[PDB]
Design a protein around this ligand. Structure first.
Ligand SMILES: Cc1cc2nc3c(=O)[nH]c(=O)nc-3n(C[C@H](O)[C@H](O)[C@H](O)COP(=O)(O)O)c2cc1C
Ligand SMILES: Cc1cc2nc3c(=O)[nH]c(=O)nc-3n(C[C@H](O)[C@H](O)[C@H](O)COP(=O)(O)O)c2cc1C
Ligand SMILES: Nc1ncnc2c1ncn2[C@@H]1O[C@H](COP(=O)(O)OP(=O)(O)OP(=O)(O)O)[C@@H](O)[C@H]1O
Ligand SMILES: Nc1ncnc2c1ncn2[C@@H]1O[C@H](COP(=O)(O)OP(=O)(O)OP(=O)(O)O)[C@@H](O)[C@H]1O
Lengths: 364, 368
């Protein structure tokens, strides 16, 4: 009615989406029409596949749940939409998003199907890599958090336990020049206490090294790449926070020597920290910049126009547990600085002229 | 001339496609609708007789601050196809997310530019994906502090004995020295007192770090088991479809409502889900069953069974022990944290090996 069927067929012939019309023959849903987009998407020529069921796109990959879903939809005559792994003529893998509508033709007294196919490989791939990045971020965050927990405990307890040892040493020195009948019992009690204090030391290290066990290696990685991976994790939601992102990367300074999951976590933490300082900020600008630097290093700058620093907050930032947030562990910057310095770099912070914060670090 | 099928048949298929399909026509800066299928009238709530020969942009309502709109405008300015999601609004005002595929097509007879547009309602995917973004952030935060907290509790528990020992050896040494006249004894006693004070200080500063990390604590509310199971699946079980892992959630409608702290039970379930997937990595059978049932003393029992690596004969009684692990990079902390959280809540928790060589974990929660 509304448009002539020739024109409509022309539109179908030239749609960018795969479009096919199938016909049920017993247990087969045989293709009776395909458009060029479908030939492109699959690599098959229409002259070759007509009057067969398209399941050959599955190749040998028949342990997919969508397949059974589709089969039951087709038995019921209900529509259905499913993603499947299909394989082009040349073998190449693509994820095919299938929308099938059973349609009953009264004249033919037959059941046809109209199917729309979109290649969704890029979405599947990016979503899978984002899942792996999310999982590994969780893993490394947990071990590194317990790992800083241990080091702070060791360094804070190091003084009392040594004091105890020294008081044992001095007491034993005083009692040596004594004949009181009870002193051998005193000396043995003091020895047992010494041993217990050593035991406290030895087992603080035991839990530390169990949580800190298992370390990685440093390889050449592109900062553009690790900045994009870190942004994918840390900066989703900037647009909803109306934060303006600017990545100024120097093409001569892009390749660094680093352990990629740890630098990912340094950048993710810096990005999150910057977003938080912009929670209620009138100006929201985030700048990431790479430049050549002095000691054959390369400097990465992350600047925000956020809450910034009070007069004497700035010199505490990288100290373990120093925090201004109600639920902050104050550990992000401490872990980041220890990681960067172990990688051969330097890290420091300063307030920006816009009232925000600028963090810089260097890597080779 | 090549006609694989009569155009009437093709028109019918389009008429009954479950997908919105429209044909628009270029008139200057308008792409006016000249055909819509019933699917589009349903999806949008508008009647063809009313929207024909207008541009579809009225679906944006007042919500024109979307990037996809400018993307589409440029694609249509060039001759290129494009695909974008928009916030559109039905006739009744209701919001829906519309997945648009537009293909400009040039008609030689008309010497005109038409467009074929395919529209999918994808509200559920956009919303679900945004809720997974929210869950990912909270899982990171809660895992970090929760691990720091089990770290803290473990260090305090192991140190409790030596520090008490030191305090007691001081108390006993002072008792022995009380009856003494050696000239040096007041100096000894003062040294022992200072050592006592240092050991107390070690204790108090361990409690200091423990309380600092556990300072973020919450309250427990009535929560739907379907929902918290789905959030945990969304985080932990996202890869099962590609791992060819068979998932089955059998939830009993008579056993559904619990009292819990939702983020902590989420982290318990996420750990169970990942752990089961890890066991079912290289197993010919990989089937995971989650089941809800009523359980004794006004409780509800949840079962998670896997056909995975399972448990050795005497590993089972170690599972809930802090730091007990079999994985090279594992912390052995997941189950210890999980059991302490559930028991700190109103339930209990235990484990057993599965008959398929896998593992089955069960827990109970209240509904009071
Ligand atoms: C119109 C239509 C299009 C289809 N397109 C595809 C496709 O592109 N790729 C694919 O793997 N399966 C596709 N299928 C599914 C198979 O034809 C078949 O129905 C499905 O694999 C379940 O049937 P089975 O029991 O033979 O496996 C399509 C089905 C229909 C009706
Ligand atoms: C075939 C076709 C279908 C369209 N369908 C929709 C739609 O369903 N919802 C929507 O918001 N925009 C839709 N658009 C986009 C608008 O028609 C318009 O192209 C877009 O809003 C950008 O143009 P503008 O600058 O006038 O806003 C469609 C465009 C075409 C060509
Ligand atoms: N861009 C910034 N703007 C303002 N303050 C910042 C910025 N970056 C860091 N800070 C300050 O430095 C402190 C330390 O941050 P750090 O990331 O080390 O821990 P945190 O974010 O407080 O805790 P968590 O371990 O949960 O991330 C923060 O409390 C914050 O006050
Ligand atoms: N579903 C499961 N299938 C097989 N083994 C399991 C399962 N759940 C737990 N285990 C075993 O119990 C041990 C303790 O697991 P838990 O989840 O507490 O810590 P983990 O997985 O070792 O460490 P992490 O905290 O890093 O996940 C694990 O090493 C694992 O061997």
């Amino acid at each position: 009615h509304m448009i002539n069927a020739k024109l409509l067929q022309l539109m179908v012939e030239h749609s960018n989406d795969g479009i096919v019309v199938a016909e049920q023959e017993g247990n087969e849903s045989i293709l009776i029409y395909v458009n060029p987009a479908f030939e492109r998407l699959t690599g098959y020529c229409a002259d070759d596949i007509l009057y067969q069921d398209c399941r050959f796109l599955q190749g040998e990959d028949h342990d997919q749940p969508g397949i059974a879903i589709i089969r039951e939809a087709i038995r019921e005559g209900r529509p259905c939409c499913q993603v499947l792994r299909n394989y082009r003529k040349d073998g190449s893998l693509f994820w095919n998003e299938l929308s099938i509508t059973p349609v009953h033709n009264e004249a033919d007294q037959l059941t046809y199907y109209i199917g729309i196919q979109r290649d969704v490989t890029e979405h599947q791939q990016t979503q899978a890599r984002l899942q792996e990045l999310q999982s590994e971020l969780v893993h490394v965050s947990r071990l590194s958090a317990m790992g800083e927990m241990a080091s702070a405990l060791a360094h804070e307890l190091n003084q009392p336990l040594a004091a105890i040892s020294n008081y044992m040493k001095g007491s034993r020195r005083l009692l040596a020049g004594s004949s009181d009948p009870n002193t051998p019992k005193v000396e043995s009690a003091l020895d047992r206490a010494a041993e217990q204090a050593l035991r406290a030391g030895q087992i603080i290290r035991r839990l530390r090294d169990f949580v800190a066990r298992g370390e990685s290696e440093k390889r050449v990685e592109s900062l553009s790449k690790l900045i994009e991976e870190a942004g994918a994790l840390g900066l989703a939601g900037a647009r909803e926070q109306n934060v303006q992102l600017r990545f100024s990367l120097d093409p001569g300074a892009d390749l660094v020597l680093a352990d990629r999951v740890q630098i990912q976590q340094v950048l993710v933490n810096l990005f999150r920290n910057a977003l938080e300082a912009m929670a209620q900020s009138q100006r929201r600008e985030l700048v990431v910049t790479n430049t050549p630097a002095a000691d054959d290093m390369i400097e990465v700058e992350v600047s925000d126009t956020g809450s910034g620093f009070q007069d004497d907050v700035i010199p505490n930032l990288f100290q373990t547990f120093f925090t201004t947030k109600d639920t902050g562990m104050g550990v992000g910057l401490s872990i980041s600085r220890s990681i960067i310095e172990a990688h051969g770099g330097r890290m420091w912070a300063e307030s920006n002229a816009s009232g925000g914060a600028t963090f810089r670090f260097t890597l080779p």
